[PDB]
Amino acid sequence: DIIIATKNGKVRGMQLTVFGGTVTAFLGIPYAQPPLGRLRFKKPQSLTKWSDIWNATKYANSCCQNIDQSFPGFHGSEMWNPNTDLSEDCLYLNVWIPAPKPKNATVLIWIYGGGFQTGTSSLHVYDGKFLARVERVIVVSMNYRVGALGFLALPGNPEAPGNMGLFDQQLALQWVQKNIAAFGGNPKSVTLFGESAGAASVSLHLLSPGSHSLFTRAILQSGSFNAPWAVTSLYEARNRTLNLAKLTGCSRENETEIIKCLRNKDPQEILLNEAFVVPYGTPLSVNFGPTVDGDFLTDMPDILLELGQFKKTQILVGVNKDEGTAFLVYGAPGFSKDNNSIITRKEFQEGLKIFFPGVSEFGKESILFHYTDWVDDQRPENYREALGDVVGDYNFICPALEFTKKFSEWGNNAFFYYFEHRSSKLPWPEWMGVMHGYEIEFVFGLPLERRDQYTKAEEILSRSIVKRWANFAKYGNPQETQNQSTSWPVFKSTEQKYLTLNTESTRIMTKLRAQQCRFWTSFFPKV
Amino acid sequence: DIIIATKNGKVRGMQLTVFGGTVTAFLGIPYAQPPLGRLRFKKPQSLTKWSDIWNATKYANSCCQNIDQSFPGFHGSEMWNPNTDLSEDCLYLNVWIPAPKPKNATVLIWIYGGGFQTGTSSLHVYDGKFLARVERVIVVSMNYRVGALGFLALPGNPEAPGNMGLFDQQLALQWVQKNIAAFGGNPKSVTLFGESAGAASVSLHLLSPGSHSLFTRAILQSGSFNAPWAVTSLYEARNRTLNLAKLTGCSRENETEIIKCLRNKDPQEILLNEAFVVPYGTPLSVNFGPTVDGDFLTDMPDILLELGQFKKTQILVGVNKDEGTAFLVYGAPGFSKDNNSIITRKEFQEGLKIFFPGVSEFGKESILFHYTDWVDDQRPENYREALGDVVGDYNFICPALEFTKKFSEWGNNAFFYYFEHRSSKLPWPEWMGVMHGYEIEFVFGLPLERRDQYTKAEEILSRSIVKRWANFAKYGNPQETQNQSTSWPVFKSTEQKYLTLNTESTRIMTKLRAQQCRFWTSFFPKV
Amino acid sequence: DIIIATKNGKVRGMQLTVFGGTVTAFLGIPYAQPPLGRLRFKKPQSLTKWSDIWNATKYANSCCQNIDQSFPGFHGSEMWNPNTDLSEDCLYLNVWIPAPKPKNATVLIWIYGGGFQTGTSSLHVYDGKFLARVERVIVVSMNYRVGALGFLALPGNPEAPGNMGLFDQQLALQWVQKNIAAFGGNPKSVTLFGESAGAASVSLHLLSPGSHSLFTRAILQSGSFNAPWAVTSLYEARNRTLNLAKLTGCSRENETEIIKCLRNKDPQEILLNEAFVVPYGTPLSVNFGPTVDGDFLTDMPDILLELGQFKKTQILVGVNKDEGTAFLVYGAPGFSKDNNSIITRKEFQEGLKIFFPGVSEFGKESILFHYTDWVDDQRPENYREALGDVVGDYNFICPALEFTKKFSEWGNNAFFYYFEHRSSKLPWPEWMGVMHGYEIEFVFGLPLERRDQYTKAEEILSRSIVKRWANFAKYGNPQETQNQSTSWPVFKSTEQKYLTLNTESTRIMTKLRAQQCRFWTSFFPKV
Ligand SMILES: *[C@@H]1O[C@H](CO)[C@@H](O[C@@H]2O[C@H](CO)[C@@H](O)[C@H](O)[C@H]2NC(C)=O)[C@H](O)[C@H]1NC(C)=O
Ligand SMILES: *[C@@H]1O[C@H](CO)[C@@H](O[C@@H]2O[C@H](CO)[C@@H](O)[C@H](O)[C@H]2NC(C)=O)[C@H](O)[C@H]1NC(C)=O
Ligand SMILES: *[C@@H]1O[C@H](CO)[C@@H](O[C@@H]2O[C@H](CO)[C@@H](O)[C@H](O)[C@H]2NC(C)=O)[C@H](O)[C@H]1NC(C)=O
Ligand SMILES: *[C@@H]1O[C@H](CO)[C@@H](O)[C@H](O)[C@H]1NC(C)=O
Ligand SMILES: *[C@@H]1O[C@H](CO)[C@@H](O)[C@H](O)[C@H]1NC(C)=O
Ligand SMILES: *[C@@H]1O[C@H](CO)[C@@H](O)[C@H](O)[C@H]1NC(C)=O
Ligand SMILES: *[C@@H]1O[C@H](CO)[C@@H](O)[C@H](O)[C@H]1NC(C)=O
Ligand SMILES: *[C@@H]1O[C@H](CO)[C@@H](O)[C@H](O)[C@H]1NC(C)=O
Ligand SMILES: *[C@@H]1O[C@H](CO)[C@@H](O)[C@H](O)[C@H]1NC(C)=O
Ligand SMILES: [Ca+2]
Ligand SMILES: [Ca+2]
Ligand SMILES: [Ca+2]
Ligand SMILES: [Cl-]
Ligand SMILES: [Cl-]
Ligand SMILES: [Cl-]
Ligand SMILES: [Cl-]
Ligand SMILES: [Cl-]
Ligand SMILES: [Cl-]
Ligand SMILES: [K+]
Ligand SMILES: [K+]
Ligand code: NA
Ligand code: NA
Ligand code: NA
């Protein structure tokens, strides 16, 4: 029976057996007033406090969200769907601590991705028990609001100010500051890590004055706020809020009246209308996401990045070799997870329409030109691979690299990785390669479980990643020092060294995607 | 009558005459609850407090320990045996202060060696009266628990958490922080110094967060925690604790029950069984020593060293020219302190078995290969000298040099010495050369006593060492500035300058044991 | 009527007219209990406090001291004799402030010289009214005890611990810290300046931990503690105290009894015996001066200087072109202030005996050799000039330069001057050149007074010195920025730039007395 006294009252955890040892799991601790009724669309409000013992022995409700129904029965898509009841009552967090209770352990705080429209902390591939067991760190993860319920913005209006889910994340960091010592944690040694939209969140906490003292350092897996899906302009955000009102029958003259009406809608009516607030979407559409609110974010984030206005600390940043491929089967013509998807030039052309719907003809021809100068054989997979690379380079890899250059130009140490191992168990087909999201199970140490059908080479690779992430969190330096590992150099503009993560041999390389990123970073923005 | 008010009450010292002046000695001040009964195997508990005057006019009990009985009646071994009653009631410390009472004197705190299985602060060669007299520093030394009573580990279990004797040392540093100003000491100018296991302790205080604010700088004489005898793995430590239980009839199912039973054993039964907790020992075996406990030591120390996680301050590190020779007469075949020990190739081979019992045949042939390429004469002492060098280089000199490179790579000033003077009075034979432990009497200034049969050259050498150690403690720079001495350069990786200490001429040299340490440091660990 | 409330009570000043403006002078403010009766030979004790108004309208008693009677009626010697009653009741200080009262003025604190055997703050050439008038700084000066009454040492015995007059100076700095804001001063911007023994005092405050927070920066005019007259060894100090006891009939067995007896002697009996505590003196003898007391001075000062243990701040240091000449007429044979003093080789030889009484024959021949290799003419003044240079280089110039190299090697800015202007009014004869002590009237701005028979060129030179000293005190940089002056470079070891101060043209030169100082600094000490 393990009971911890928190600031707001007692909580009871549960003991788990993990690799011949024990971890204590406190699952579903609340960290804010449930955001219901008059609190829908508002900043999270602080927790009242309880007497008696709160039982943190099961995962809580996931936040309301639309679900992926493109591949019913298929584990490759379905593993990302929520595995707890959906509810507006979802502001809870999880804590995994080593047993015996540690004395002053580093804390790793996970922020899930999902486009800021989806996601939940309770997914199997984010289970923190393995990290707590093996590295003796404490792992924390939180649910935060997503979609319109988390990001609806009528900027400047506190009834719906925008960025509510980012404030949810913030309030959970504050909970760790006030409470984690009771669990044997060091509030002075907190590292945020997150993937995709979770990585873009981590990058925005580096920018938010109110987050600066709530953590020590940051890890960004395939995401950063300068990615083109990551931040909505004030103009598109007001437009979206108003389109949502049109569709739900809540157009009014007074803006506060609009929100009042929106608070009477059932969550379903709101979720059903989210896809249509926009005239054309792509598979990467973020209809309701971070905005410049004058509160969480004081100015356009590209300006803060460029002018050095962010927390000074070390970062670890990385991407997967085939980021863009998972998205091609959610609308590009000629793609299928169930065949080899050899597409024509005409199909490639139509795919650019799917992925770059607002872009001029010239803009799209410039993409085709940069990506279809073949080298040179008449390989049939040319157009299929080019489309995946287009989508991965624009959306993930070039923004990650550019975030990393700009951040390290102000004097701090940065480490960059390129993940290139395809899981032996991936249910998606082979042409999709080393997909977006499929490093996460390596970072959380799932292949450390022998029962679990990963190869030996994969266990060893995961074990080494876990040690490098942990050494980064504790010490600021992602080395694996005992096993003659390749030493991981800092990423500097100029040399731009990065480390490859793979099962065969780990390499130091330079200037990842140099020709492609010159295209996306210096030319495409002008288009 | 000299009485000092401490935090826990009054203590009375005694006045000594030393070189026509006076020193006040407070011998046997307690600094913790005696660790008896239910306190055996636990962290030291803080002192209650007394009324009336505590008389600190004699050395206290030394901690329980096995004694060296290899050479009964021989001063060379017997001078290292305890010279006060053994008792579990042994947590006391000594203070020597100049007379008249100084105003804000630097403090030197001595930590004795003995393998973490033996040792005591009351030995003649650790008498602090000469340093206090001549350099006007205050000298403090403490008894700390050794053997299973000090280092038994069932890691994570507070009944026997491990590292108890290191916590004893810590609690004595805390006593100096709270109390030394009353004696005319500056708690802000404390230097730790220690030899062998005492030097490895000093190096672990550089690593322990709880020790960081309890001292200013560090001196390491023939020892550092990366020496292969200095730290026990969790795995060997649990195994040893359980083997100890088997032998004492204390195997139980509940671990806390094991410890409860262990607390009913007479100390002798525990001491008698210590040698056998291990399947084969060597003369350097440390059966019960420092472990990674999650408390004193938060992670494997080689990781902390490599990643720069330790107190930033100057260090003084050194070794003796023939470290390994003293050990050859505690089991290598063909050695004797009573003859010249000319050994054959076959004897050298068997000696490697004595010193490298768990090592593969290949591992041992690789030692023979590196050390027996003769230059080149057919000198009969070849194999005898090679064995001493093998044992000194692996166990002391290469680990000291590697500690020193890694520590100074993070920006702090380091000074390295090579002691090469054989005492005119050494009772051990000539082939043993400049032995392990025989600088200590020079550091404590014993040859400053003319009555004492050291040569003039030795008095002068000791006087100069004492001044360099004192200048290091007070000022961070071990120079002797008045007598046209050789200026002592800082040790940097790259140049690796060190200073030789000898009676003839003091030299600046580079890259001590460069070829040997490449062997022990980069190859041998792989074996 | 100008009345200032101090910590110890009200004081009344007087108004002076100075160059068509007003200065307020508070002369004779007490700063310690008078050191009489049982307080003779002890550290100064803090002031009780008074009611009613203390009248600070006249200079106080000067401390007991022997007087210079070598040239009765001669202004050149007599201007340095005390011009107020002598009394053991002499711990007072003076304050000159601009009118109107300034708001946060820099403070300059003057410490007079006189061999630590003589001197007083009330001399005409130390009048601070001109500096306060013209630079709007506040000037403070104090009387401090001299001779045995100020420096008698039985080291470690608080009845006569040594350095009492240095503690007098310290207690006056503390008075300025606690009280100067009431006078419109900035306790955060205090510069010490002093000449000869006063300059050596300033250099020892840079070394004393208890003085570190009592001032900001330092100016050293012809003096520093590494000069060979500036510090007495423990051995000579005990010997002197005991010789004093022999002569006064106070030899006892108990040392505290010796001091008790010494406290019954009339001050005259003590002063009369001071010259004889030593077997042979020279004209630069300092019979009772600073010692290493373990209190003011924690270790030998040459060690602290060399190892960088002193306050980190800017210094201004300088010397006069003919330091040594004033001393030749107090005992060297063949010298007279009343003729041209052309001396023979034999007279030069005897003069070395006067100035280097304890030195071997070899030591003295080595001086003759270094200084009498003529260039080359058979000029009759050769030996006369050589003796002056011997005495100035050994006693003042080489020690000042060496202090300045060592101090600036630890990173702080240093400025060095060479004063080479002979006052138009000097009453001493022409062969004595630019004498020791005759910059002081330039620093205090006496030639700014037109009524006063200095030339125009001298007024301008003084005005420029005053501005450079003031800019140094206020800003750390002794520039005169408005009148196209020669920019004063920092003194670095390596280049060793210094500035010449003269009436014609001000020059930047390098490596003052390079060949002579190599002799005194690297060879002579071995002799
Ligand atoms: C792989 O499967 C895809 C997905 O269906 C096939 O794409 C279809 O091809 C037809 C022609 O029969 C188009 O008119 C359809 O509209 C496509 N369907 C969709 C739903 O996009 C593709 O042709 C197959 N490719 C292979 C076998 O190489
Ligand atoms: C020096 O003394 C040693 C120590 O005894 C001798 O070693 C023994 O040599 C014998 C042969 O007589 C071996 O079988 C023994 O087992 C050795 N004894 C032990 C106890 O180790 C050595 O031979 C002598 N060496 C000399 C005189 O050069
Ligand atoms: C200048 O005056 C000095 C000082 O008196 C003269 O020195 C004396 O010379 C005589 C020879 O008549 C020595 O025996 C004396 O002992 C010296 N007297 C003292 C008191 O030192 C010196 O000769 C004169 N030099 C000149 C005129 O060039
Ligand atoms: C944990 O470590 C920090 C520094 O990182 C320290 O200030 C803090 O007080 C520690 N707390 C413990 C050991 O409880
Ligand atoms: C280091 O290597 C060993 C195998 O030689 C393995 O058991 C262990 O998991 C490795 N540790 C890390 C952190 O990679
Ligand atoms: C001793 O020295 C320190 C600085 O090293 C100072 O802060 C402290 O207060 C001093 N104490 C004394 C002189 O009592
Ligand atoms: C310096 O040298 C002298 C002998 O010339 C000697 O008496 C003294 O002990 C030496 N001091 C040190 C610190 O070595
Ligand atoms: C004088 O200047 C200092 C800084 O040099 C400042 O901190 C202080 O308060 C000032 N006092 C005044 C203007 O009274
Ligand atoms: C600057 O020069 C003028 C004459 O041109 C003079 O009156 C003044 O005293 C000078 N100031 C200083 C500080 O030297
Ligand atoms: Ca999977
Ligand atoms: Ca010895
Ligand atoms: Ca004059
Ligand atoms: Cl085309
Ligand atoms: Cl390159
Ligand atoms: Cl062989
Ligand atoms: Cl070299
Ligand atoms: Cl001659
Ligand atoms: Cl030059
Ligand atoms: K090898
Ligand atoms: K010479
Ligand atoms: Na489903
Ligand atoms: Na014995
Ligand atoms: Na006179």
DSSP letters, B128-164, are THHHHHHH--EEEEE----HHHHH-B-TT-TTSBS-H
d(CA C313, CA C317): 13
Burial of C312 (0-12, 13-18, 19+ CB in 10 A): exposed
The 3 state secondary structure assigned to C352-376 is HHHHCCCCCHHHHHHHHHHHCCCCC
d(CA B175, CA B168): 11
Q: Which residues pair with B105 in a beta bridge?
A: B185
Q: Which residues of B237-258 are buried (b: 16+ CB within 10 A; e: fewer)?
A: bbebbbbbbebbebeeeebeeb
Measure C370 CA to nearest chain B CA, in Å. Answer: 22
CA A368 from centroid of its chain's CA atoms: 29
CA atoms within 13 A on the CB side of C415: 24
Tokens linked to A259: 């929100």
CA-based nearest residue to C245, from C263, C233, C228, C229: C263
Contact yes or no for B471 and C302 at CB 8 A? no
Contact yes or no for B303 and A482 at CB 8 A? yes
Please report how the helices B164-179 and B197-205 are oriented relative to each other, as an axis angle in degrees rounded to 10.
70
Q: Which residue has the tokens 């650019």?
A: A352
For A325, residues 6+ apart whose C-beta sits below 8 A from its C-beta are: A388, A391, A392, A431, A432, A433, A435, A436
Q: Is residue A188 less than 8 Å (CB to CB) from chain B?
A: no
What are φ and ψ of residue C428, in 5° steps?
-75, 155
d(CA B3, CA B38): 34
Contact yes or no for A136 and B294 at CB 8 A? yes
Q: Which chains touch C (3 or more CB pairs under 8 A)?
A: B
Residue ranges for the known binding site of C for substrate are 114-115
What 3-state class would DSSP assign to C234? Answer: helix
For strands C10-12 and C3-5, give the pairing: antiparallel
Measure A476 CA to nearest chain B CA, in Å. Answer: 9
CA-based nearest residue to C112, from C96, C93, C130: C93
Q: Domain C1-527 is of which CATH architecture?
A: 3-Layer(aba) Sandwich (3.40)
Q: Is A410 annotated as a binding residue?
A: no
Q: Is A114 annotated as a binding residue?
A: yes
Which ligand is closest in space to the CA of residue A381?
Answer: 1
d(CA A492, CA C362): 65
Partner residue facing C295 (CB), from B103, B476, B482: B103
Active-site residue C323, yes or no? Answer: yes
For C23, residues 6+ apart whose C-beta sits below 8 A from its C-beta are: C15, C16, C96, C97, C98, C99, C129, C132, C133
Q: Are C282 and C330 in contact (CB under 8 A)?
A: no
What are φ and ψ of residue B115, in 5° steps?
80, 10
Residue B249 backbone zone (phi > 0: left; psi -120 to 50: alpha; other: beta): left
How many angstroms is the resolution? 2.4
DSSP H/E element including C220: strand C217-221
Tokens linked to B93: 């410390």
CA-based nearest residue to B191, from B162, B220, B166: B220
Residue length, chain A? Answer: 527
For strands A105-111 and A217-221, give the pairing: unpaired
Measure C496 CA to nearest chain B CA, in Å. Answer: 23
d(CA B370, CA B355): 16
d(CA B81, CA B98): 28
Tokens linked to C54: 């203390």
CA-based nearest residue to C237, from C172, C297, C303: C297
Long-range CB pairs of B344-349 (<8 Å, 24+ gap) are: B344/B383, B345/B372, B345/B383, B347/B383, B348/B372, B348/B383, B348/B386, B348/B387
Q: Are A180 and A107 in contact (CB under 8 A)?
A: yes
- Is B340's C-beta closer than 6 angstroms to any atom of ligand 2? yes
Concatenating the DSSP letter of every residue in A323-378 gives TTHHHHTTT-TT--TTS-----HHHHHHHHHHH-TTS-HHHHHHHHHHH----SS-
CA-based nearest residue to C171, from C107, C291, C91: C91
Concatenating the DSSP letter of every residue in A256-318 gives HHHHHHHTTS-HHHHHHHGGGGSSS--TT--SS--B--SSS--S-HHHHHHTT-S--S-EEEE
Domain-wise residue ranges, chain B? 1-527
Q: Which residue has the tokens 């062998």?
A: B196
For A395, residues 6+ apart whose C-beta sits below 8 A from its C-beta are: A227, A228, A229, A284, A323, A324, A327
Indicate which residue's Cα is closest to atom 7 of ligand 8.
C188
Q: Which atom of ligand 3 is nearest to the CA of C339?
A: 1
Kindly identify which residue of chain B lies nearest to residue A481, measuring between CA atoms.
B303
Residue ranges in A104-196 assigned as alpha helix (H): 129-135, 147-151, 164-179
Residue B89: cis peptide before it, omega within 30 degrees of 0: no
What are φ and ψ of residue A335, in 5° steps?
-85, 145
Q: Which atom of ligand 8 is nearest to the CA of C181?
A: 14
CB count in 10 Å sphere of residue C284: 18
For A392, residues 6+ apart whose C-beta sits below 8 A from its C-beta are: A319, A322, A323, A324, A325, A436
d(CA C222, CA C397): 7
- Is A439's C-beta closer than 6 angstroms to any atom of ligand 5? no
Tokens linked to B2: 């000299």
Pocket (CB within 6 angstroms of ligand 4): A 103-104, 186, 188-189; B 209
CB count in 10 Å sphere of residue C500: 18
What 3-state class would DSSP assign to C198? Answer: helix
Residue A264 backbone zone (phi > 0: left; psi -120 to 50: alpha; other: beta): alpha
Pocket (CB within 6 angstroms of ligand 8): C 103-104, 186, 188-189
Q: Which residue has the tokens 């505690």?
A: B330
Q: Which residues pair with C26 in a beta bridge?
A: C95
Contact yes or no for C306 and B481 at CB 8 A? yes
d(CA B3, CA B55): 9
Residue ranges in B479-524 assigned as alpha helix (H): 514-518
At least 3 CB pairs under 8 A between chains B and A: yes
> Could you give the C-alpha distances from C107 to A138, A267, C53, in angstroms and in order?
58, 74, 24
d(CA A142, CA A95): 9
d(CA A450, CA A455): 9
Tell how far the Cα of B512 is from the centroid of ligand 16, in angstroms: 10
For B392, residues 6+ apart whose C-beta sits below 8 A from its C-beta are: B319, B322, B323, B324, B325, B436
End-to-end CA separation in angstroms for chain B: 62
d(CA C227, CA A492): 54
Per-residue DSSP letter, B394: I
What 3-state class would DSSP assign to A521? Answer: helix
Q: Is residue A479 less than 8 Å (CB to CB) from chain B?
A: yes
Measure A486 CA to nearest chain B CA, in Å. Answer: 14
For strands A138-142 and A185-195, give the pairing: unpaired
Kindly identify which residue of chain C lies nearest to residue B98, measuring between CA atoms.
C156
d(CA C60, CA C86): 9
Q: Are A160 and A259 in contact (CB under 8 A)?
A: yes
d(CA B195, CA B197): 6
Kindly identify which residue of chain B lies nearest to residue A477, measuring between CA atoms.
B307
Indicate which residue's Cα is closest to atom 7 of ligand 6.
B188
d(CA B242, CA B102): 51
Q: Are A414 and A317 in contact (CB under 8 A)?
A: yes
Contact yes or no for C309 and B479 at CB 8 A? no
Radius of gyration of chain B (CA): 22
Partner residue facing A100 (CB), from B156, B299, B309: B156
Tokens linked to A468: 């490098």
What sign for the dihedral angle of Cα B4, B9, B10, B14?
negative
CB count in 10 Å sphere of residue A479: 18
Contact yes or no for B474 and C209 at CB 8 A? no
d(CA A460, CA A479): 15
d(CA B72, CA B180): 40
Tokens linked to C150: 């100020």
Q: Which residue has the tokens 């506190």?
A: A158
d(CA A86, CA B167): 51
CA-based nearest residue to B174, from B31, B30, B9: B31
What 3-state class would DSSP assign to C313? Answer: coil
CA atoms within 13 A on the CB side of C67: 15
Residue C376: cis peptide before it, omega within 30 degrees of 0: yes
Q: Which residues of A touch B295 (CB under 8 A)?
A: 103
Active-site residue B420, yes or no? Answer: no
Residue length, chain C? Answer: 527
At least 3 CB pairs under 8 A between chains B and C: yes
What are φ and ψ of residue C422, in 5° steps?
-85, 115
Q: Which residue has the tokens 């006030």?
A: A178
Which ligand is closest in space to the CA of residue A72?
Answer: 21
What are φ and ψ of residue A17, in 5° steps?
-90, 130
d(CA C318, CA C224): 10
Q: Which residues pair with B14 in a beta bridge?
A: B25
